[PDB]
Design a binder for this molecule. Structure first.
Ligand SMILES: [Cu+2]
Ligand SMILES: [Cu+2]
Ligand SMILES: [Cu+2]
Ligand SMILES: [Cu+2]
Ligand SMILES: [Cu+2]
Ligand SMILES: [Cu+2]
Ligand SMILES: [Zn+2]
Ligand SMILES: [Zn+2]
Ligand SMILES: [Zn+2]
Ligand SMILES: [Zn+2]
Ligand SMILES: [Zn+2]
Ligand SMILES: [Zn+2]
Lengths: 334, 334, 334
């Protein structure tokens, strides 16, 4: 059909939000049009002013989440402005053929391209830049995000019963490899190209200098904490385009989790910690039962607390003493 | 109900054993009372006398395993004696709210607190210390163990048929980060506080100096080997509160494994090696079919053999030639 | 039965091919005889002539894949020629008892042994050398491969429907630990024994110098690329006997994947990236829908592109515009 089908245009929004969309839908297949514009820029990634010579989709790490339904066609215009120094492309893990689209979206600065592919498989899928010979650098420098392809009748549990979320959040976790000089301080680079050789040396050690949600230590804390309320079901989409992570909600659970991120498979329930394979996006549902400030983090606690892979969720509502109660507050031992 | 329910008191036992308990039970929900007392102490962790400035629940690494049934309430008195230097708390991954209980169990030396929570989800769950600003250090220094919440009707296979174990063992695997001095020898510290800064430096490299079962290289070997017999089904509970591991039984299998450790999910069968995500506890059932000395180990063989993540299981009984037979012993090539 | 049963002899073939075999079979159980001869040799592992003092089964990394059916007995003659310097053995993860067979196959140079075991569990299973006190070194130096034990009625999907492959490939991924001298260049060793101490130092850092498919950077590229055609279903068997990996097919998927590699468990579908636990073999089915050159790689992109864990699959056939179409080729921005 394709060329026969109706088209719709979607306006993308910045992480950690996800653009408005339906879950279960009575709509038939559409060509869903998206546009993204690559921005290279220096970004401050921690609380002591370390910078990253970063590369982004639409100015953010991660790039925005694109949401369609199974059977839809994704039609992306990828724009690489002449103000950028490097060629780029996009590899959609949700797509079939031509290195995910990368061979057909090879754009030099001042060019754009339009790729169409059929989203014939449900799930959360990573997309990332994949320019020939420079793949890992472009990815670790920030160029990834999530395509979510929802089943046309919405999410299902292992018995085929309906599942839903009331709010979606998208978290991209970024293993960064910032070089240091002879003084042990992080290097600051005047240009993207100048960061390259030293960064590759760091990459090859396999030890990140920082591991951050959404582009910086503390990105999802303070004023920028995620929010929910008791009784609300959140979807937490978690992408890691290069390295394994193990998400966990402190004082919560993964009620239903697709850790490999593919919705035609039954989810697991009651998880404490789940596993996102480097090069993938997964999805967890949780319904809040207690108010308070939760942490959502990578449960390698070093990676979380020392290197930056941790955020907060501030939840409104009424405390539930049946679920948890302080029987005796801290007080002197008898 | 809660405040209406009967109470029972459980006496904890040292790993690798697990306190006596029922699997399937005709008992209704209870408030099950536990107590644990934190002990900070220096411990020798390898065969060359390296020490760790350790922190423990009840004097052991891991802390003891607490066993209840789904629908029970866990009521823990946590005691931090004035002979300890640091504040502590407990975060139960099996609990809902208040950072796992951590916000309600913040105990300075000379204090205790009593926390109650509903164990409303079946599985093996990590619990660990989580004091504000010092979480990874307290965890890697030894403060973790397992809460096992058994379904009220016992374990089930993927078709809903009953499964059981005749003996449970609990194995906590500890990634340690022991600093070295300019001479390349491990540092020995006079106090817990003095170990801190140097240990954090090591932690941030993400490379453990040692990875040990149950507190020391060779903890589960020699006189301290696990034991079983042909025909006996063992449960191996495996916790790793900070870092991924991949358990394996040499010459055996995981007959039924919940690698994410949550019993409402169907187990997998016939595993060679399974995966415990950092920040979780999993469970494997195996029924011994051959006598002999098995290894139970982390199948990154470096981590196992060089760094310490390996134990033994000595199994009694009759050799089975149908399962395995030496047809020709080693002898000269013809 | 065993001693009653018919015997068959199988001729092994070099990776990445797998010896001819049936999937579903009307044949009853057999004693299936195999022979392998250990070869120690120096091998060049990258494009700049770095060498590895390697140890192999049948002269290749990985060793050859052995294929039987559930209920068959594997009977392996393991030959260690007097031209080798070291003792060897074999541990079959598919076997039950005696440390996988290792205790019964302990062969010094100039000896051979014959081991029989029942392949009573379906799946892909690692086998590897396991000589007492030298296990990790022998494994990381190249001594591993795959035993595939097919269900007697062939592969099944989660609903019990038949699945099949038209071509099997076997990929062993090898984390290598090549030492360097004071000049920062890789060391070349005159003998296997001389490589030992320095290699163990590298191993303990847990950082591989190289991570290669099938014995060398680029082993599965150029003339040596894997091949298939549109409409053909390939099985990709992936073993990693020491360290975790995360396979991915760029521009493809895992249509059906047993990432833990055990066929009595239902596979997952539509995977972007899957996970092979160190110490295991997994299996993925994919049916090609687009022609072109695909990459099959470890999706830690550093490990793939910088360290060597990547291969190619060249696929013949007709491009499918419904699945993917370049709507606008790269061209100047309007
Ligand atoms: Cu790019
Ligand atoms: Cu990719
Ligand atoms: Cu503590
Ligand atoms: Cu935790
Ligand atoms: Cu060997
Ligand atoms: Cu093994
Ligand atoms: Zn149209
Ligand atoms: Zn809702
Ligand atoms: Zn009461
Ligand atoms: Zn029994
Ligand atoms: Zn015979
Ligand atoms: Zn076919």
């Amino acid at each position: 059909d394709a060329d026969k089908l109706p088209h719709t245009k979607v306006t993308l929004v910045a992480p950690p939000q996800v653009h408005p969309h339906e879950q279960a839908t009575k709509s038939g297949p559409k060509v869903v049009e998206f546009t993204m514009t690559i921005e290279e820029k220096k970004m401050v990634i921690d609380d002591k002013g370390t910078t990253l010579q970063a590369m982004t989709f639409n100015g953010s790490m991660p790039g925005p989440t694109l949401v369609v339904h199974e059977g839809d066609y994704v039609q992306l215009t990828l724009v690489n402005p002449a103000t950028n120094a490097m060629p780029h492309s996009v590899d959609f893990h949700g797509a079939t053929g031509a290195l995910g689209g990368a061979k057909l979206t090879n754009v030099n600065p001042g060019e754009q391209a339009t790729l169409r592919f059929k989203a014939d498989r449900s799930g959360t899928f990573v997309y990332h830049c994949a320019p020939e010979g420079m793949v890992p650098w472009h990815v670790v420098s920030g160029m990834s995000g999530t395509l979510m392809v929802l089943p046309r009748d919405g999410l299902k549990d292992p018995q085929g019963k309906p599942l839903h979320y009331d709010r979606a959040y998208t978290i991209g976790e970024f293993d960064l490899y910032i070089p240091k000089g002879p003084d042990g301080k992080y290097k600051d680079y005047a240009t993207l190209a100048e960061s390259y050789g030293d960064t590759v040396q760091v990459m090859r050690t396999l030890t990140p200098s920082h591991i951050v949600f959404n582009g910086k230590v503390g990105a999802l804390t303070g004023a920028n904490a995620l929010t929910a309320k008791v009784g609300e079901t959140v979807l937490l989409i978690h992408s890691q385009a290069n390295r394994d992570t193990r998400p966990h909600l402190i004082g919560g659970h993964g009620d239903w989790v697709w850790e490999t991120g593919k919705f035609a498979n039954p989810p697991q329930r009651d998880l404490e910690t789940w596993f996102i394979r480097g090069g993938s996006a997964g999805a967890a549902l949780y319904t809040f039962k207690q108010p308070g400030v939760y942490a959502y983090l990578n449960h390698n606690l070093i990676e979380a607390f020392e290197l930056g892979a941790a955020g907060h969720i501030k939840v409104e509502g009424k405390w539930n003493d049946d679920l948890m109660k302080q029987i005796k507050a801290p007080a002197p031992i008898p």
